[PDB]
Amino acid sequence: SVLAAANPIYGRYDDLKSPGDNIDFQTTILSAFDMIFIVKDDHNEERDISIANHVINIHTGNANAMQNQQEENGSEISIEKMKRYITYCRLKCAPRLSPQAAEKLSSNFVTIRKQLITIRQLEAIIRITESLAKLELSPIAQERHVDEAIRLFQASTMDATSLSEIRRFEQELKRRLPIGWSTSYQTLRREFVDTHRFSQLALDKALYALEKHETIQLRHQGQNIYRSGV
Amino acid sequence: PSYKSNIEDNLLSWEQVLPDLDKIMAPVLGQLFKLYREANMTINIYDFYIAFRETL
Amino acid sequence: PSIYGHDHIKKAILLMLMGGVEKNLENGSHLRGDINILMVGDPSTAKSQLLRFVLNTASLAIATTGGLTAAVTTDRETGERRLEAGAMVLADRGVVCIDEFDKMTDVDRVAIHEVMEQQTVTIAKAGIHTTLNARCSVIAAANPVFGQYDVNRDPHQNIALPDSLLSRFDLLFVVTDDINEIRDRSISEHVLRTH
Secondary structure, eight states: OOOOOOOOTTSSOOTTSOTTTTOOSOGGGGGTOSOOOOOOOOOOSHHHHHHHHHHHHHHHTHHHHHHHHHHHHTSSOOHHHHHHHHHHHHHHOOOBOOHHHHHHHHHHHHHHHHHOOOHHHHHHHHHHHHHHHHHHTOSBOOHHHHHHHHHHHHHHHTTOOHHHHHHHHHHHHHHHSOTTOEEOHHHHIIIIITTTSSOHHHHHHHHHHHHHTTSEEEEGGGTEEEEOOO | OOHHHHHHHHHHOGGGTOOOGGGTOOOHHHHHHHHHHHSOSSOOHHHHHHHHHHHO | OOSOSOHHHHHHHHHHHHOOOOEEOTTSOEEOOOOOEEEEEOTTSSHHHHHHHHHHHSTTEEEEEOOTTOOOEEEOSSSOEEEOOOHHHHTTTSEEEEESGGGSOHHHHHHHHHHHHHSEEEEEETTEEEEEEOOOEEEEEEOOTTSSOOTTSOHHHHTOOOHHHHTTOSEEEEEOOOOOHHHHHHHHHHHHHTO
16 A cells, blocks of 8 residues: 655745646556545645644644643554554455445436546545445445545546536626636625525635636635636 | 725715615626626626626 | 447458458569558547557457567576567457557667568668568557647647658548547547446
8 A cells, every 4th residue: 555745846835736737756646546635735824823823732742641641532543553443444344235225325426427537437436445344343444434535536637407507707708808817706606696696605616617728817815806718 | 185095985885875666776887796706807798798797 | 339430440440350461573573462441630539548458459469668679689597688579560360459658769760661561670780680471451640749739730849749750551540539528428428427
């Protein structure tokens, strides 16, 4: 089992570019990894303060008492005991999928395939639900593992009739916003969603789709939206 | 006076001046100024006309 | 049987196995009769599957990928050396199965130029000179660099092989998993039957 950490070229991953361009190796390697994580560290106010407070406690030494109490509470597992648990899990159980989990796997992947990922990608999700079943030592993999697996897969692989409504928003925004004009995310919420011309999910998906189709660019954490192309 | 600023504020914040379609739609002169701020340096007027029309 | 559709490709495989007819002339010339097939498109989409069937079915099928030129020697324990045969030479009156054809070297390409056109290999090495018959039918698979085939353009820009090399293939087919969900469900059900 291989856990690979790679530093993207140009130092920082540019969201304007396809993942292939922010990468220096063979493209076929992208077809090898089951999952990839393009983590981002965009600057923010309240999240930084919460993270910063966490760091200060660690150097304070409070984290030692906090973790031990959390271990006493059971919310945290000892590193040796967890390793003993993992070793026990590996040797003893070997789950297998259930028809309910598989049927949802096919249906969701069909929607992914139609919107666009290869046939191989769906079978990679089969490993994740097996892995979660292994942790629970359940005799069979369950659909409730797939939901997180799909979410993890979406939050990993997609780093960079409702479709008709989403594409209609694309059609409508191409008329509302000429090429080269700028607006804000909340402005679209007040003008298109508060007027109920389109749903907020359609707003989210259309903006997600338009950026990948080089139509628009999202700037300043949504405070500015600029139409880059047709 | 802030001669330039007052015009821009009146164009944006019409409710600070004005006290059955009247109850809903603001005057076009102030509303059109919103697109002007969002517009680029050079404007294809046909696209601007369509963009203005979509908001009505 | 594991591939749904691709009737022309399956017909092409049958025709390539049947082959043509060679001829001889009073001037001493000879005419090629065999047929070659080339496959292009997305890597994992049905190319390794089709090649697996043909390689397993054909009686004289040889698998190749990127010493096939048969112009190199191997030495004994006492020092004396002997040439080793190559897949193109060994596949005389047979078929050559190539995977990762795009990955083969330029040395292979210049040698296979005479193989596909003149059905012979003209070996010219230091102290060794001979001509070996290479009357072999060729079926090969290749993939674009980006992984996703640009259907709007020929393989001369999607794969960038020389036109002289590409012109030596009698038949060329491009396949890519353009998705029809109800149709892909039909073929994937048998795959799901194995899970």
